[PDB]
């Protein structure tokens, strides 16, 4: 009856899996922000703008990619939390099926 | 005893969660490929290379971001599969706890 524990564990994974999905939607938003800036970067090069104009925009793009990478690493860590909960549940079910 | 089903469902989530983690590692590899190309893009602008040189590289960067986005969408769909398995398991445990 104690293996209550599976429900609680499942309550966590479902909320945390939803948190991943939200983080992935943020990640798409950030990737869509690259599409915008890279199309502007093209336009500056098409226009023949200055090295300062292009460099400024390119510095902004580099920052954005670093933010994207940090978000991705956070997502990977959260996935490892979700994997750890999956393993927990598998073991709980294994010990549960060991009963007559 | 049939709720066998939880173990099988958990077998799927654990393998699929590991597939997410692998996909996220690929996603990092692709984001690291942006860091390389954007640093080269800076160098071309620093050198004062031609519009063709920069445009070529920038076209490659745009393709890469589209590949990154498609991978992310695939990951989101796989997460929704994992969420659907989590919900399945929660319902199985709910019907299981409804016994005396």
* Helix/strand/coil (H/E/C) assignment for every residue in chain A: CCCCHHHHHHHHHHHHHHHHHHHHHHHHHHHHHHHHHHHHHHHHHHHCCCHHHHHHHHHHHHHHHHHHHHHHHHHHHHHHHHHHHHHHHHHHHHHHHCCC
Number of CB pairs < 8 Å for A and B? Answer: 113
Residue A79 near residue B22 (C-beta atoms within 8 A): no
Provide the domain count of chain B.
1
Domain of residue A23: give its range.
1-100
Residue A7 near residue B90 (C-beta atoms within 8 A): yes
Q: How far apart are CA A2 and CA A92, in angstroms?
A: 10
Q: How far apart are CA B67 and CA B29, in angstroms?
A: 12
Hunting for tokens 């909320």 — which residue is that? A15
B interface test, pick of A17, A21, A55, A69 with most B CB neighbours within 10 Å: A17
User: How many CB atoms are closer than 10 A to CB B90?
Assistant: 16
Residue B89 near residue B12 (C-beta atoms within 8 A): no
Residue A82 near residue B17 (C-beta atoms within 8 A): yes
Q: Which residues on chain B are in Cβ contact (under 8 Å) with A32?
A: 69
Q: Which residues contact A82 (CB under 8 A, 6 or more apart)?
A: A13, A16, A17, A20, B17
| Å between B84 CA and nearest CA of chain A | 9
Q: Which residues contact A12 (CB under 8 A, 6 or more apart)?
A: A85
Residue A64 near residue A37 (C-beta atoms within 8 A): yes
Q: Which residues contact B17 (CB under 8 A, 6 or more apart)?
A: A79, A82, A83, A86, B82
* Residue A77 touches chain B, beta carbons under 8 Å: no
Q: How far apart are CA B70 and CA A10, in angstroms?
A: 29
Residue A29 near residue A94 (C-beta atoms within 8 A): no
Q: How far apart are CA A89 and CA B89, in angstroms?
A: 10
Angle at A85 between CA A82 and CA A88, to 5 degrees: 155
Q: How far apart are CA B77 and CA A36, in angstroms?
A: 24
Nearest to B69 by CA among A39, A21, A31: A31
- Contact between chains at A21 and B80 (C-beta distance less than 8 A): yes
Nearest to B30 by CA among A60, A31, A82: A31
Nearest to A77 by CA among A14, A19, A9: A19
Resolution in A: 2.9
Alpha helices in chain B (DSSP H): 5-47, 51-97
Name the structure determination technique: X-ray
Q: How far apart are CA B70 and CA A15, in angstroms?
A: 25
Nearest to B50 by CA among A59, A55, A45, A62: A45
Q: What does residue A67 show for φ and ψ, rounded to 5 degrees? A: -65, -40
* Residue A86 touches chain B, beta carbons under 8 Å: yes
- Across A51-73, b (16+ Cβ under 10 Å) vs e yields eeebeebbeebbebbeebbeebe
- Contact between chains at B24 and A76 (C-beta distance less than 8 A): yes
Nearest to A13 by CA among A98, A100, A90, A96: A90
Residue A64 near residue A33 (C-beta atoms within 8 A): yes
Residues 16-55 of B with CB under 8 A from A: 17-18, 20-21, 24-25, 27-28, 31-32, 34-35, 38, 41-42, 45-46, 48, 51, 54-55
């Amino acid at each position: 009856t104690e293996i209550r524990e599976l429900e609680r564990s499942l309550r966590l994974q479902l909320v945390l899996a939803i948190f991943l999905l939200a983080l992935l939607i943020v990640l798409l938003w950030l990737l869509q922000q690259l599409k915008e800036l890279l199309r502007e970067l093209e336009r500056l090069q098409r226009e023949g703008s200055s090295d300062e104009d292009v460099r400024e925009l390119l510095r902004e793009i580099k920052e954005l990619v670093e933010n994207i990478v940090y978000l991705v690493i956070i997502i990977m860590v959260l996935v490892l939390v979700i994997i750890a909960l999956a393993v927990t549940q598998k073991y709980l079910v294994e010990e549960l099926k060991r009963q007559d």
